[PDB]
Amino acid sequence: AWINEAAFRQEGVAVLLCVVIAAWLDVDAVTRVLLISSVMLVMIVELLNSAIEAVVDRIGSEYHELSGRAKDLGSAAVLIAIIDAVITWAILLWSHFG
Amino acid sequence: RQEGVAVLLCVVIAAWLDVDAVTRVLLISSVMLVMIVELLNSAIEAVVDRIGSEYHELSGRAKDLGSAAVLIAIIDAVITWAILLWSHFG
Amino acid sequence: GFTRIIKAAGYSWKGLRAAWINEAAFRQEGVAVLLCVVIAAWLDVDAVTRVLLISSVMLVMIVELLNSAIEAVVDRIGSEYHELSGRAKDLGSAAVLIAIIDAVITWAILLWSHFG
Numbered sequence: 228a229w230i231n232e233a234a235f236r237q238e239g240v241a242v243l244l245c246v247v248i249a250a251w252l253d254v255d256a257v258t259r260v261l262l263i264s265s266v267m268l269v270m271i272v273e274l275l276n277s278a279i280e281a282v283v284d285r286i287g288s289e290y291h292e293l294s295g296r297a298k299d300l301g302s303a304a305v306l307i308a309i310i311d312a313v314i315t316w317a318i319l320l321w322s323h324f325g
Numbered sequence: 326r327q328e329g330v331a332v333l334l335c336v337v338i339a340a341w342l343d344v345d346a347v348t349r350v351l352l353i354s355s356v357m358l359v360m361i362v363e364l365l366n367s368a369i370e371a372v373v374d375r376i377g378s379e380y381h382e383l384s385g386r387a388k389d390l391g392s393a394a395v396l397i398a399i400i401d402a403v404i405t406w407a408i409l410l411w412s413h414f415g
Numbered sequence: 416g417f418t419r420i421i422k423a424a425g426y427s428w429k430g431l432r433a434a435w436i437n438e439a440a441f442r443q444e445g446v447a448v449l450l451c452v453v454i455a456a457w458l459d460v461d462a463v464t465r466v467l468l469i470s471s472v473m474l475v476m477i478v479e480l481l482n483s484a485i486e487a488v489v490d491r492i493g494s495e496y497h498e499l500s501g502r503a504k505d506l507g508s509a510a511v512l513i514a515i516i517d518a519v520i521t522w523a524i525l526l527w528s529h530f531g
């Protein structure tokens with residue numbers, strides 16, 4: 228039901244492409260696992276974030292400081308996850324094709 | 326809890342196999358990740374239920390989203406074990 | 416598309432800033448994580464090992480943030496004791512601890528192999 232939204236689609240596709248790319252690369256096994264897991268974690272974390280966003284919104288439209296805060300914190304996690312993935316790919320591919 | 330059974334076993338098997346430390350860290354973390362995601366999913370369910378037993382579009386949305394996260398974590402785990410065991414026994 | 420990023424980035428900054436400003440323990444964890452990343456970056460190890468040392472402490476930060484987000488929600492609903500509120504927090508806290516243990520182990524194991 229949730230898959231049919233422009234934000235999740237654009238997100239799922241990026242990750243999915245990375246997994247596909249990671250499956251084609253001529254890298255050793257552990258590197259391949261690290262390339263795939265890192266981007267999948269992005270998707271996992273984004274899903275939990277959106278889940279939290281849903282709960283907040285479920286409570287209602289009336290703004291509360293802690294409502295904004297839960298979403299910010301959620302967003303921050305997605306950001307750290309993405310940075311983790313960027314760092315992971317950078318280090319492992321530089322090592323490999325550099 | 327039978328998740329810890331599945332978990333301990335994965336930890337046992339990973340401990341038993343003659344793999345290097347890096348491989349062993351990945352076999353274990355991939356399983357630990359499923360547990361972290363499940364506990365966070367469960368926490369989100371706890372909150373959805375704390376708000377009300379009554380149905381709401383957004384309450385089900387939250388639960389579907391958390392559940393999809395657990396699934397992706399499980400898939401990540403299966404892929405990790407497949408790839409590493411294939412390579413270990415390659 | 417461009418704005419989704421810009422918006423989310425700004426929320427992310429507010430989240431980090433809020434977590435930092437509100438708890439000493441969060442700041443101290445941030446210091447620990449940053450020291451760990453820096454050490455991992457300045458260490459004579461292969462790339463995969465470097466990535467594991469780094470991603471393991473990052474995960475700690477990720478689960479810390481998600482869990483604090485859940486706490487924010489619980490606290491938002493009511494200050495009153497409620498079984499499901501205590502439970503949400505208990506579960507979330509379990510998650511954070513596992514992430515931390517996984518990290519300590521990951522570093523213990525990998526640093527043993529390299530140095531020992």
Ligand SMILES: CCCCCCCC/C=C\CCCCCC(=O)OC[C@@H](O)CO
Nearest residue numbers: 238241242245266269312313316419423
């Ligand atoms: C060689 C190609 C890959 C290079 C390495 C980098 C790949 C891994 C990094 C990112 C993939 C996930 C991106 C998520 C989509 C996104 O931006 O979401 C923004 C908002 O929607 C968040 O709410």
Ligand SMILES: CCCCCCCC/C=C\CCCCCC(=O)OC[C@@H](O)CO
Nearest residue numbers: 328331332335338356359399402403406
């Ligand atoms: C002679 C043969 C030796 C090799 C035998 C290989 C056996 C592999 C056994 C287990 C791997 C499991 C990977 C998925 C982890 C997972 O699913 O975590 C549990 C949760 O999903 C529970 O909800």
Ligand SMILES: CCCCCCCC/C=C\CCCCCC(=O)OC[C@@H](O)CO
Nearest residue numbers: 310431432433435436445448449452476
């Ligand atoms: C590669 C490392 C990426 C990050 C790794 C994870 C650790 C992140 C640690 C802290 C998050 C940002 C903290 C912001 C600092 C802050 O709030 O100062 C006070 C001012 O706001 C007052 O006006």
Ligand SMILES: CCCCCCCC/C=C\CCCCCC(=O)OC[C@H](O)CO
Nearest residue numbers: 241244245247248249250251252253254
């Ligand atoms: C986000 C969009 C990215 C778009 C990128 C476009 C350019 C293609 C780059 C890499 C693909 C893999 C290419 C290398 C495959 C490779 O290493 O193959 C060796 C062996 O033959 C494998 O068995």
Ligand SMILES: CCCCCCCC/C=C\CCCCCC(=O)OC[C@H](O)CO
Nearest residue numbers: 250254255256259403404407408411412
């Ligand atoms: C129940 C079975 C689940 C099956 C899940 C499929 C996972 C797809 C991942 C990679 C595709 C490429 C194949 C990877 C094989 C492999 O070990 O690659 C590492 C090293 O490159 C080896 O040298």
